[PDB]
């Protein structure tokens with residue numbers, strides 16, 4: 001698998017790329033992890049993550065914050081067994097608290113994370129759970145999220161003549177359209193079969209071509225083929241309903257708004273995608 | 278908990294908590310312990326502590342302080358670190374009478390750049406490279422410590438926290454209010470520290486945002502559109518700024534040869550895109566035959 005990155009002036013691109021691949025390798029995800037929680041059903045994971053997306057939009061949190069929270073939730077639940085459904089809200093909101101303190105300049109205060117649970121989770125309960133999560137994850141809290149892969153691919157795609165890959169230079173619509181498919185896929189626990197970079201490469205493929213996918217990701221067709229095929233009914237449901245338009249957010253420059261996590265009710269789309277195969 | 282460790286003495290108190298010297302009861306290893314109180318934190322575990330812990334788990338390099346363990350006991354978090362003897366701020370102030378010898382200045386700068394090159398290849402900005410945060414041992418090695426202000430940058434970056442880095446060491450693009458910043462801000466701080474070691478005094482000892490700007494212009498010349506395209510349109514820039522002129526580096530840093538004035542002036546290049554990287558700085562001729570001496574403590 002080739003290095004898609006350009007010549008970087010701040011570090012050697014062969015090493016930066018190597019450190020990224022080893023990252024995706026050592027962070028482990030298990031599509032079967034709900035089997036350790038027999039009282040739980042995958043739909044409850046979909047409900048929880050859909051709700052975290054909704055919360056992220058209310059507070060204008062970043063897509064990376066949401067996908068950090070998703071990764072922390074899925075990875076933490078793989079470390080536990082026998083969790084009851086009335087606890088999922090606390091685990092989810094506490095994953096988002098951790099993620100927002102990592103990622104946001106000015107994260108919402110504890111009392112907002114408690115507030116959005118409408119009394120289900122107090123501040124004290126969130127502080128207890130965040131330590132449970134971080135300890136159980138062994139403080140491994142720096143994954144490459146699904147959306148960070150999308151950001152890398154977009155940057156490589158729109159590399160101009162400057163090759164300064166750190167300044168953003170990709171257009172907003174293609175980014176939010178692919179993010180919107182990833183946001184629907186991630187609600188299906190079956191997505192965890194596939195490394196995050198392949199989920200992002202596969203979703204990108206469904207909005208472009210083989211040639212672009214390969215150019216920006218270094219993957220060959222055979223590496224993503226299974227994920228692409230798994231994703232087909234999700235792409236179709238997104239195509240059928242139309243891609244969302246770009247939202248405006250108070251205090252957020254319009255040129256930065258594509259970075260803010262958005263939300264629409266997505267559970268009917270999800271069942272529609274899962275009904276097709 | 279504080280079973281497996283025997284505290285020996287408080288040895289300092291960084292802006293994050295108290296630092297203790299301690300001893301592992303099983304191995305007899307001496308360690309340092311950063312105490313992060315949690316009962317004084319309405320937001321639970323401080324974001325600076327979550328960042329520092331998770332980043333140091335990913336960063337194992339000879340010139341980065343090693344995090345050995347994280348202990349949760351009572352309402353405290355204890356960060357167990359490898360033990361180093363002295364920070365560079367206290368080491369210079371004690372050597373300021375004679376200055377810091379030059380063969381050591383070559384090694385310490387060289388090592389700080391391998392630590393930094395490593396961070397940047399892992400896409401980590403340190404954002405507080407000041408001497409108090411650089412830790413030396415008796416064996417001559419120097420290491421980056423205190424990653425509480427650090428941040429992992431994306432590809433691409435977005436706007437991050439404005440006003441990072443202690444003011445004396447803050448790069449001019451941050452002071453001018455640039456929308457984006459990345460690896461160049463760490464290089465600038467290492468330049469400030471390079472020249473502070475040589476002259477024994479801080480290179481840009483401003484005491485305000487606009488004052489710190491001016492101490493840089495007085496020494497490097499007030500930049501313009503030719504040396505730094507786009508500078509006059511940066512948001513914290515005013516046309517009323519006084520137009521200073523550059524100084525000979527024989528005058529800013531007398532003890533430095535031609536190679537030293539070269540490498541240094543590349544680290545303090547105004548335009549962040551033309552500023553030298555840590556990877557390139559390691560290859561500069563100045564580190565032709567770099568040495569490894571033992572310090573006087």
Ligand SMILES: CO[C@@]1(C)[C@H](O)C(=O)C(C)=C2NC(=O)c3c(C)cc(O)c(C)c3O[C@@H]21
Pocket residue numbers: 288289290291292296308309311342358359360361362363364367409410412422423
């Ligand atoms: C060199 O000692 C100290 C007290 C230095 O003087 C100083 O000012 C500060 C702020 C220090 N902070 C630390 O956090 C730390 C760390 C990560 C590791 C370590 O091994 C020591 C001895 C540490 O303590 C130093």
